[PDB]
C-alpha cells in the first residue's frame, strides 16, 4: 500500500482532479500577461521549436475593378526557429494527508499546490516582460526597436497623459495604429490615482478612454517603467507547448513531491508596436 514504495501514481482520480482545478484557479487569478496576448494553439509535448517568423513589413495593398496591381504578399524577412523553454516549480505532501483524506478529512488539503502555482505564474509573467540573455530571449522592455520616449513630468498635475499621447503619436507614425493596451509599474499606477487639489477627474479614466483594451499593473516590472502595445496578432503571439500541469517526481523519504509545468515562448512578430520610457 503505502509501504510497497515507488508506486507509479500515489493519488486516485479525484485527487488528480482537485490538484488540477486548484492550479488552474490560482493561475487564472494571478496572471497578467496572458490577458493581452492571443496564444498560439496547443502544439504538444514533442514539439520543441517554433518558427519565430517576422521582423518587419508594410505594404498598402490596393483596389481595382479587374485586379492587377502587383502588391507583394507579406511573406517574411528571416526565418529563425527559436526553441521553447520550460517553467516549473515543485512542492511536497506528507504521505499521511493522502490517508486522512481517504478516511477523515474527505477533501484533500493542497495549499502547497496553490503556493507553487503562484510562483510558477510569477515566473511566466517575468519571462514575457523581460529577457534573460542566458538563452538569448527578448523581453518587451528589452527588445531592440522599442521607440523610446522620455516621460519625466509626473508628481504634478500638468502632465501624465501627454507621455502616452506621445507614445500613440510615435506608434502611429510607423503606420501601426489600432486598439492599444497599456501596462504600468506600481510606483506609477498608484501615482495615477492622486486626488490633488482642483481635482476634476482622476487620470486613469482618461487613460482608459485612450487605451480601450485595459490599463494593467504588474509587479514584475521595475520601479519606474511601463509600456504601450497594440493588442492584435501579427504583432505579438504566445506559443504554448503545454499549459500548467502537475507531474510526479518519484517518492523520496516516503513523502510525495510534485511539480507544476508549462512550456511557453513569446514571439513578437512585429517589434514596432512597442513603446517604453
Amino acid at each position: 500500500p503505502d509501504f510497497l514504495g515507488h508506486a507509479e501514481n500515489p493519488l486516485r482520480e479525484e485527487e488528480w482532479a482537485r490538484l488540477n482545478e486548484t492550479v488552474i484557479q490560482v493561475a487564472r487569478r494571478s496572471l497578467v500577461g496572458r490577458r493581452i496576448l492571443d496564444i498560439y494553439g496547443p502544439l504538444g509535448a514533442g514539439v520543441q521549436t517554433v518558427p519565430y517568423d517576422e521582423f518587419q513589413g508594410v505594404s498598402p495593398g490596393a483596389v481595382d475593378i479587374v485586379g492587377e496591381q502587383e502588391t507583394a504578399m507579406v511573406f517574411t524577412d528571416a526565418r529563425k526557429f527559436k526553441t521553447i523553454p520550460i517553467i516549473y516549480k515543485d512542492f511536497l505532501l506528507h504521505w499521511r494527508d493522502i490517508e486522512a483524506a481517504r478516511t477523515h478529512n474527505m477533501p484533500l488539503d493542497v495549499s502547497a499546490a496553490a503556493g507553487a502555482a503562484a510562483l510558477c505564474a510569477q515566473q511566466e509573467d517575468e519571462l514575457i516582460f523581460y529577457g534573460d540573455a542566458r538563452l538569448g530571449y527578448e523581453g518587451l522592455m528589452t527588445a531592440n526597436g522599442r521607440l523610446t520616449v522620455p516621460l519625466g513630468d509626473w508628481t504634478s498635475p500638468g502632465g501624465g497623459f501627454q507621455a502616452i499621447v506621445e507614445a500613440t503619436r510615435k506608434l502611429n507614425e510607423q503606420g501601426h495604429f489600432g486598439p492599444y493596451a497599456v501596462v504600468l509599474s506600481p510606483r506609477l499606477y498608484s501615482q495615477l490615482h492622486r486626488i490633488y487639489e482642483k481635482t476634476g477627474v482622476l487620470e486613469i479614466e482618461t487613460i482608459r478612454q485612450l487605451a480601450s483594451d485595459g490599463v494593467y499593473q504588474s509587479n514584475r516590472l521595475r520601479g519606474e517603467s511601463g509600456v504601450v502595445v497594440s493588442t492584435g496578432r501579427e504583432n505579438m503571439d504566445l506559443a504554448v507547448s503545454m499549459d500548467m500541469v502537475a507531474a510526479y517526481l518519484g517518492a523520496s523519504r516516503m513523502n510525495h513531491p510534485f511539480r507544476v509545468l508549462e512550456a511557453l515562448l513569446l514571439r513578437i512578430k512585429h517589434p514596432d508596436a512597442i513603446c517604453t520610457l
Binding site: 492550479v23 488552474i24 487564472r28 496572458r34 494553439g41 483594451d213 504554448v240 500548467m244
Partner: peptide, 12 residues
C-alpha cells in the same frame, strides 16, 4: 487524449 488546453484562454 486530445491536446486539451487547460488554463490559458484569457480573452484578449
Amino acid at each position: 487524449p486530445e491536446k486539451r488546453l487547460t488554463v490559458g484562454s484569457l480573452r484578449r
